[PDB]
């Protein structure tokens, strides 16, 4: 069992759980791993994260008032690293209609990442970050379509200067 | 709106259950028998317990895999099947994965102050995930996989003889 190659360019939607708030938040997701840029649209904000630059933008969907700020965090792609240990492979659904998926744990320096990806074509289904086994942040992805249909989603409005 | 699917009421597979108090995921095998309202779960290493929940008899047993000490205590709360109640509000329909390798699923919220929200398959109504949340805190959530219908040998639900003597 060798890690697959997740698509580095796709659009879909996500449900993100945070333990601090303890909540799930649904949003659309534009993931561009080639340009290391990602934009999420709340389903009330829109966020545009440009990692090649040092900047992220937070936009009121109604107001367009834009707050720009240094990104701080380093880039972490939505794929399974080569040095990640294989944990399990299971099937979601059941007999007459199933996905086979696999689960991987990178354990990046006691913070550990654990991601579940589809087996043959490797769309991301879920990603979970956990500190000392206390699940800090988890996200599920669905309706994935490869590539970006309109890259203007990553260009900030003129409100952000 | 669409009409709820009726999930199979007898199947066995595996689960990972996340609990907000501990904040942890726990993997285990699961034998779900909704017809006899009995369910048995077997902890997986990834203090290793086995739980047998018999709702018709109102009794639950936790049995411990290493030593087989069984503790029997009365089942407090009522039975709730792994299906979508009829008065569930429909939330969304999704696709997991991508082209040629995917499943279409739907998410339902019954909201039986407590809210239940579970996502089940569209075409065959296999359960994929169950979530219980109090006032927007995720309290509990469990994901199911490797489901095969029916129960292979119902003896999975008979407690060990250590459990008969227990109090």
UniProtKB/Swiss-Prot annotation, chain A:
This entry's Gene Ontology molecular function terms read: calcium ion binding; ganglioside GM1 binding; identical protein binding; phospholipid binding
Q: Which family does it belong to?
A: Belongs to the ependymin family.
**Quaternary form?**
Homodimer.
Question: Per UniProt, which keywords does this protein have?
Answer: Disulfide bond, Glycoprotein, Lipid-binding, Lysosome, Secreted, Signal
Q: How is it modified after translation?
A: N-glycosylated; the glycan contains mannose-6-phosphate moieties.
- Disulfide connectivity for this sequence is 4-122, 66-160
Q: What is this protein called?
A: Mammalian ependymin-related protein 1
Q: Which gene encodes it?
A: EPDR1
Q: Which residues of the full protein are shown?
A: 39 to 211 of 224
């Amino acid at each position: 069992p060798r890690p697959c190659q997740a698509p580095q360019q796709w659009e879909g939607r996500q449900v993100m759980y945070q333990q601090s708030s303890g909540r799930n938040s649904r949003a659309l997701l534009s993931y561009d791993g080639l340009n290391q840029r990602v934009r999420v649209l709340d389903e009330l904000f829109e966020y545009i994260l440009l990692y090649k630059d040092g900047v992220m933008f937070q936009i009121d969907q109604a107001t367009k008032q834009c707050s720009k700020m240094t990104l701080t965090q380093p880039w972490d792609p939505l794929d399974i690293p080569q040095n990640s240990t294989f944990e399990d492979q299971y099937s979601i659904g059941g007999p007459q209609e199933q996905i086979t998926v696999q689960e991987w744990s990178d354990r990046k320096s006691y913070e550990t990442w654990i991601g579940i990806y589809t087996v043959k074509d490797c769309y991301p289904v879920q990603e979970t970050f956990t500190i000392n086994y206390s699940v800090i942040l988890s996200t599920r992805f669905f309706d994935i379509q490869l590539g970006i249909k309109d890259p203007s989603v990553f260009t900030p409005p003129s409100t952000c200067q």
